[PDB]
């Protein structure tokens, strides 16, 4: 699962979930050897408004969300951006060090 | 996803990397209802959708 943890300005600690990643096989020998994965990530972005951005993705509509605002609850559809992707031991190493 | 990402979340006293990932993940899914039957709204042109 794609998770992060954080604290608000108000101080409350919180766990967020963005989506999921399904790891393929990973007999990674060379530092460039590839792991195939599938990322399934939530979004409210309509992909058709900028379809060139999403060449590699297959976007699903998976739900409806009642979103609270100032003084009006809004109804927006919930998309799921699915795609096959890949990474390597070296690329993962440098991702772990992004701090 | 960068700017286009969307989060399901829970209030949770846990620290910056605490708890079992899939247990936390299910906790986040249970906050959201109104899942639909899934439908393709934008195809991956080169792939079996």
């Amino acid at each position: 699962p794609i998770i992060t943890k954080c604290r608000d300005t108000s101080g409350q600690r919180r766990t967020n979930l963005y989506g999921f990643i399904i790891k393929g096989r990973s007999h990674l020998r060379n530092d460039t050897d590839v792991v195939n994965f599938i990322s399934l990530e939530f979004s409210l972005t309509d992909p058709r408004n900028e379809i060139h951005k999403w060449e590699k993705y297959c976007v699903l509509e998976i739900g409806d969300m009642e979103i609270r605002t100032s003084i009006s609850t809004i109804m927006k559809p919930v998309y799921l951006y699915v795609r096959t992707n890949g990474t390597s031991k070296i690329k993962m190493k440098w991702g772990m060090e992004m701090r | 996803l960068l700017m286009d990402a969307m989060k399901l979340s829970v209030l949770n006293p846990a620290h910056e990397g605490e708890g079992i990932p899939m247990k936390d993940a299910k906790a986040c899914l249970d906050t959201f209802w109104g899942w639909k039957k899934a439908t393709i709204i934008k195809k991956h042109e080169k792939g079996v959708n």
Binding site: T45, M65, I67, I74 | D4, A5, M6, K7, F32
Partner: peptide, 10 residues
């Protein structure tokens, strides 16, 4: 604005 597309109040 009205809401957050990234961390929406639901």
């Amino acid at each position: 604005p009205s809401y957050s597309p990234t961390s929406p109040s639901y």
